[PDB]
Ligand SMILES: *[C@@H]1O[C@H](CO)[C@@H](O)[C@H](O)[C@H]1NC(C)=O
Ligand SMILES: *[C@@H]1O[C@H](CO)[C@@H](O)[C@H](O)[C@H]1NC(C)=O
Ligand SMILES: *[C@@H]1O[C@H](CO)[C@@H](O)[C@H](O)[C@H]1NC(C)=O
């Protein structure tokens with residue numbers, strides 16, 4: 153016969169065995185997370201080892217077929233996924249030391265403890281106490297101490313480790329066909345073989361650069377406003393022309409500015425919309441919270457949840473004797489099993505998070521028909537994008553009033569819209585410069601453009617130029633500032649967040665045009681529009697079978713990511729920022745620094 | 749053909765080389781096993797026909 157039929161039979165066998173093995177592994181992991189005990193840990197470890205061994209064996213087997221002879225455009229992608237060489241091509245010693253470096257980095261990040269100055273009573277881990285201090289404490293000296301101490305604690309330790317890590321991962325990439333490890337990470341966005349819809353690995357660089365060039369005015373105006381507010385809060389520390397000091401941003405790394413809503417609130421008198429008291433008065437529970445979330449997807453035209461989902465999923469915190477992790481997660485265990493692991497309480501944030509997780513499950517249900525290898529989102533961004541569009545639509549006052557939590561009497565003014573848009577701005581627009589900067593720095597380091605002797609110098613120079621953030625205490629090459637961040641330490645790609653941020657607003661613009669909304673984009677509800685639901689389901693069903701470019705074309709009418717939907721979303725805040733920044737300088741000067 | 753029964757397990761020779769009655773590259777046993785568990789969703793649950 154032809155190798156194409158041989159590859160087809162191989163793929164059929166692999167799919168049918170892999171479904172069962174993945175189900176066993178997923179059930180073991182779910183059991184461990186719901187009920188933590190030694191036996192559960194042993195079962196999960198066994199299942200994970202078995203699944204990893206099976207994937208390695210099948211990946212080794214699949215290399216027989218050259219991809220040149222495959223021309224189905226589905227078998228080709230499945231065989232490409234299997235031939236990615238999850239089997240470590242590196243030498244045995246190189247693989248062992250790479251695993252050792254990864255384990256050491258994870259251990260240092262997790263167990264990094266900061267002790268009080270000249271006080272041995274407490275040595276604080278990053279997550280429990282230090283993060284809360286950075287988030288809520290208003291002490292400039294305390295925040296500067298926390299930031300500097302964490303940097304010296306983790307970055308100095310991890311700097312040789314990060315150098316060895318980048319060397320080894322660059323060697324792995326060179327062993328593979330990819331130019332560098334940045335190219336390996338960007339390969340997910342690559343599309344080959346489909347003319348007129350193709351993508352290049354380097355094309356992502358140009359697209360991200362152009363998108364940030366478009367975003368920059370809004371970030372500059374928000375930066376000017378936040379600078380004015382933080383100068384009002386802290387008089388002497390912040391300069392008008394200078395960049396913002398790092399530790400005052402709101403979190404340890406400056407990723408999110410959500411903690412600045414209290415300090416930078418536009419109108420104190422106007423109370424934020426929150427439905428906690430109303431839900432308590434109406435006597436809700438987590439089960440009906442999730443049911444109300446389900447009714448939204450039923451209204452949009454998507455299917456509703458399975459009886460197995462309702463029976464197996466734990467939506468309420470067991471409490472008492474039971475021990476479990478409370479990080480929300482939507483599990484597609486396989487073969488028709490879908491569950492949510494969420495300790496849901498009666499709060500507005502929990503309600504929106506439930507909406508987000510059920511969006512995940514609707515995506516998973518939609519791509520269930522496709523083969524196992526293609527049973528994923530088209531790119532790393534679409535999956536959380538589909539979650540986030542539902543999360544945004546759920547919180548709209550129109551949806552709240554339709555559900556009935558909000559009284560018919562209430563009407564929204566200019567002030568409420570401005571407050572909500574500025575809060576979501578600090579949440580969403582602020583993280584884009586940080587993601588852009590981190591990915592640019594890491595890509596340049598991987599390519600080798602940034603020399604080792606100038607790693608941190610170039611890092612802080614680019615942060616000062618792009619993010620408009622200046623280091624409080626100057627740091628030499630001994631520090632490794634990026635190593636502090638969780639994704640940098642544990643080797644996670646970070647451009648996914650930028651792509652998600654653009655994609656969610658492109659999706660929202662498309663679905664709001666589908667729903668025939670008139671007015672500002674923020675007060676847009678897609679609940680009862682069955683056109684928007686079908687337009688979404690078109691992409692949701694594809695999975696990875698079609699290229700992500702074609703999926704994005706299907707949803708939003710464009711083959712490439714555009715920030716125009718985001719700017720249309722934040723246009724009211726953009727006008728308000730123009731008005732408020734008439735007496736405030738726009739732009740930042742690099743020269744100023746807190747030191748000297 | 750309609751109303752036919754096959755029970756003999758010969759290693760499928762999708763490849764160009766004889767399988768010689770053993771499993772390996774391009775040599776797969778035709779029979780595959782359903783796995784039935786209580787937690788499976790409707791559509792993968794075992795149905796008696
Ligand atoms: C993976 O490595 C093997 C050698 O172990 C090689 O034959 C194969 O072509 C590699 N696959 C790719 C696509 O890098
Ligand atoms: C929900 O799913 C059931 C089948 O499980 C179906 O009968 C029903 O019509 C669906 N929708 C509603 C509104 O209950
Ligand atoms: C957790 O699993 C164990 C079996 O390993 C079982 O005995 C126990 O009842 C389960 N639940 C709790 C709360 O421990």
Ligand SMILES: *[C@@H]1O[C@H](CO)[C@@H](O)[C@H](O)[C@H]1NC(C)=O
Pocket residue numbers: 550551554677679680
């Ligand atoms: C959607 O339809 C239901 C039908 O009863 C209606 O009660 C609800 O107000 C509608 N929602 C919107 C936002 O139009």
Ligand SMILES: *[C@@H]1O[C@H](CO)[C@@H](O)[C@H](O)[C@H]1NC(C)=O
Pocket residue numbers: 564565566567
């Ligand atoms: C919106 O702004 C205009 C212009 O200042 C003002 O006259 C109007 O009352 C505002 N509406 C409110 C109070 O939300």
Ligand SMILES: [Zn+2]
Pocket residue numbers: 508509512536539
């Ligand atoms: Zn999510």
